[PDB]
Amino acid sequence: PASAMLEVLDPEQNNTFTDHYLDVPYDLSKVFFITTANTLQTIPRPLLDRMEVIEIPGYTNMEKQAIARQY
């Protein structure tokens, strides 16, 4: 279901998109998803083309101590 969620990622095709159960035009264009990914190799190439990648380094024990104490 790649194009099934490309059609909802892009707000232009949702202007009059009708689901197979509701069959009435509806504008799902005001949503702007921000997503998190665990693995990127398995993500399709067109999907990886339209998103910008941001990488989280990790954590240290010194930071973890403060995280646990304060949060």
Next chain:
Amino acid sequence: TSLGRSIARSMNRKFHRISLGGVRDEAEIRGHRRTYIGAMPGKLIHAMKQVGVINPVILLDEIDKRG
């Protein structure tokens, strides 16, 4: 791939990339038999559906990378 849009705009013909390479079987290029449950046509004719004309341009990406 940008050459695809350049050529299509020169021709003023509709362009639609089709994501291949990651496929594994034959029943997805051409729709599997209607008898098997959940019969759906092949991705190709899906792209043919997406366009409203009989002469679009289709790009077949990275073909050089069980059915």
